[PDB]
Amino acid sequence: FCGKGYHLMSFPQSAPHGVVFLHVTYVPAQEKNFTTAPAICHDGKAHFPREGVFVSNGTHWFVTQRNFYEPQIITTDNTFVSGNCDVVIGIVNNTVYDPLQPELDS
Amino acid sequence: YTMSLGAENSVAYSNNSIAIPTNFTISVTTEILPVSMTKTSVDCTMYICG
Amino acid sequence: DSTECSNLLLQYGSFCTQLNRALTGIAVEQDKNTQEVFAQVKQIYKTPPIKDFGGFNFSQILPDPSKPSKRSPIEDLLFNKVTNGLTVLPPLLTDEMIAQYTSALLAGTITSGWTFGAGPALQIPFPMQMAYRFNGIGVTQNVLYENQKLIANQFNSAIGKIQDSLSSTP
Numbered sequence: 340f341c342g343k344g345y346h347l348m349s350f351p352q353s354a355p356h357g358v359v360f361l362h363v364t365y366v367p368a369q370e371k372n373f374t375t376a377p378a379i380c381h382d383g384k385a386h387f388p389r390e391g392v393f394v395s396n397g398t399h400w401f402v403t404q405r406n407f408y409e410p411q412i413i414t415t416d417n418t419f420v421s422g423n424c425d426v427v428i429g430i431v432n433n434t435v436y437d438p439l440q441p442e443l444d445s
Numbered sequence: 446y447t448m449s450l451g452a453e454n455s456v457a458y459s460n461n462s463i464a465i466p467t468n469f470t471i472s473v474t475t476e477i478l479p480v481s482m483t484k485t486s487v488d489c490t491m492y493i494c495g
Numbered sequence: 496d497s498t499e500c501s502n503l504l505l506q507y508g509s510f511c512t513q514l515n516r517a518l519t520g521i522a523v524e525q526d527k528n529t530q531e532v533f534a535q536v537k538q539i540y541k542t543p544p545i546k547d548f549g550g551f552n553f554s555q556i557l558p559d560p561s562k563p564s565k566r567s568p569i570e571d572l573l574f575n576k577v578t579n580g581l582t583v584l585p586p587l588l589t590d591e592m593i594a595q596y597t598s599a600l601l602a603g604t605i606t607s608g609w610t611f612g613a614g615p616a617l618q619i620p621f622p623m624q625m626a627y628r629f630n631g632i633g634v635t636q637n638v639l640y641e642n643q644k645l646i647a648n649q650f651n652s653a654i655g656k657i658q659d660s661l662s663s664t665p
C-alpha cells in the first residue's frame with residue numbers, strides 16, 4: 340500500500356493537479372542460508388524462540404531476529420518452555436544456557 | 446514475440462533450511478496520484494445559442 | 496456499406512470518433528486491470544519437485560502436470576463452471592499465462608511466505624511459516640508445533656470441502 344518492501348515512512352510532494360508520495364521502505368538484502376529447527380530439546384523440555392528463530396551455521400545453534408541476521412546465544416531469556424521433546428516434529432538437541440547458573444555457583 | 450512473464454526463480458525449498466537477511470537497502474519509490482481536474486464551466490445557453 | 500448514409504453521418508461530426516475512443520479506453524482499461532491484479536511479481540517462482548510441506552497438501556491448488564492447460568483442479572473446475580461492426584478483442588494475457596502468474600504467486604507464498612512480496616524470496620519451512628502466521632494473530636508457536644498434524648488435516652479437509660462446494664453449487 341505504501342511502496343514495495345516493508346514500509347518505514349512516506350513524504351508528500353505537491354504536483355500539478357496531483358500528489359507524489361515518496362515511500363521510504365526497508366528491503367532485505369544479502370540473505371544467507373542457515374539450518375533451522377522449530378524447537379530446541381534441553382533437559383527433556385522443548386524451548387521455543389520468544390521473538391526470533393533458531394538458526395545454525397553448521398556446527399553451532401543461535402537465535403536471531405527474523406528480519407536481520409544477529410546471532411545470539413540460546414538462553415532462557417529469549418526462549419520459553421512448553422512441553423517435552425516427544426511432540427514437536429523436528430526438534431533437535433542443543434544446550435540452553437542459564438544466565439543465573441554462574442551466579443549461584445559463585 | 447510471446448511476452449515473457451518474468452525471470453524464473455526456483456526457490457531452494459527444503460524442510461529444515463531458512464534464508465536470513467544479513468543486510469538491508471533503504472529504498473525510496475515514487476507514487477503519482479491525480480487529485481483534481483481543471484474546473485470547467487459551460488454556459489449551456491451561450492454554447493448552444495450564443 | 497452505404498456511401499450516402501456515411502455522407503449524411505458526416506454532418507453530425509466526430510461522434511463516431513468519440514465512441515471508438517471510449518471503447519478503446521475501456522478495452523485498454525481491462526488489460527490494465529488484469530496487469531494490476533495478476534502481474535504483481537516479476538519472478539516466476541516454482542515449487543520444489545518433492546512436496547514435503549510437513550503434512551500440508553496443496554495438490555488441489557497447485558497446477559496439474561497431467562492437464563495440457565497447466566491449471567489446478569480448482570482452476571479447471573472454475574473454468575468449466577463459467578459459460579454488424581462488432582468485434583471482440585482478445586485479452587493481452589491468455590488464460591495459461593494468468594494461470595502461470597497464479598502458480599508463481601502460489602509457489603512464492605508456499606516456499607517463502609510473505610518475504611517474496613517485500614523483496615527477495617527467502618526460503619522457510621512451511622510449518623515455521625505457519626507458526627509465524629500464528630504469532631501474527633497472537634497465538635504462540637508451541638500451539639502450532641504441538642498440533643501440527645491436526646492443523647494440516649483440518650487444512651486439507653477444508654480445501655477438499657472447498658472443491659466439493661464449488662463442484663456442487665451452481
Ligand SMILES: *[C@@H]1O[C@H](CO)[C@@H](O[C@@H]2O[C@H](CO)[C@@H](O)[C@H](O)[C@H]2NC(C)=O)[C@H](O)[C@H]1NC(C)=O
Nearest residue numbers: 373394395396397398399400401409410411412
Ligand atoms: C558458527 O559460529 C560460531 C560462533 O561464531 C563459530 O565458533 C567460533 O569459531 C571461531 C573460528 O575458529 C573460533 O575462533 C571461536 O572460538 C568459535 N567460538 C566458539 C564458541 O566455539 C563456528 O566456527 C561457526 N561455524 C561455522 C561452520 O562457520
Ligand SMILES: *[C@@H]1O[C@H](CO)[C@@H](O[C@@H]2O[C@H](CO)[C@@H](O)[C@H](O)[C@H]2NC(C)=O)[C@H](O)[C@H]1NC(C)=O
Nearest residue numbers: 379380381382383384424425429430431432433
Ligand atoms: C536427543 O536426546 C535424547 C535424550 O538425551 C535422545 O533420546 C534417547 O535416544 C536413545 C537412542 O535412540 C534412546 O536409547 C534413549 O532411550 C532416548 N532417551 C530419551 C529420554 O528419549 C535422542 O535420541 C537425541 N536425539 C538426537 C538427534 O541426538
Ligand SMILES: *[C@@H]1O[C@H](CO)[C@@H](O[C@@H]2O[C@H](CO)[C@@H](O)[C@H](O)[C@H]2NC(C)=O)[C@H](O)[C@H]1NC(C)=O
Nearest residue numbers: 369370371372373455456457458462464465618
Ligand atoms: C542456499 O542453498 C541452495 C542449495 O544449496 C542454493 O541454491 C542453488 O544455487 C545455485 C547458484 O545458482 C544454483 O546453481 C542451484 O541450482 C541452486 N539449487 C537449488 C536446489 O535451488 C542457494 O543459492 C543458497 N542460498 C544462498 C543465499 O546462497
Ligand SMILES: *[C@@H]1O[C@H](CO)[C@@H](O[C@@H]2O[C@H](CO)[C@@H](O)[C@H](O)[C@H]2NC(C)=O)[C@H](O)[C@H]1NC(C)=O
Nearest residue numbers: 366367368369370408466467468469470471472
Ligand atoms: C551492507 O550493504 C552496504 C551497502 O548498502 C555496504 O556498504 C558498502 O560497503 C562496501 C565495502 O565495505 C563499500 O565499498 C561501499 O562504499 C559501502 N556502501 C555504502 C553506501 O556505505 C555494507 O558494507 C554492507 N554490510 C554488510 C555487513 O554486509
Ligand SMILES: *[C@@H]1O[C@H](CO)[C@@H](O[C@@H]2O[C@H](CO)[C@@H](O)[C@H](O)[C@H]2NC(C)=O)[C@H](O)[C@H]1NC(C)=O
Nearest residue numbers: 546547548550551552553554555568651654655
Ligand atoms: C494430497 O491430496 C491428493 C488429493 O486430495 C491425494 O491424492 C489422492 O491419493 C489417493 C491415494 O493415493 C487416491 O486414492 C486419490 O484418488 C487421490 N486423489 C486425487 C485427486 O488424485 C494425495 O495422496 C495427497 N498427498 C500427497 C502427498 O500428495
Ligand SMILES: *[C@@H]1O[C@H](CO)[C@@H](O)[C@H](O)[C@H]1NC(C)=O
Nearest residue numbers: 428429430459460461547549
Ligand atoms: C526433512 O526431510 C528429510 C528427508 O529429506 C527427513 O529425513 C527429515 O526427517 C525431515 N524433517 C522434518 C522435520 O520433517
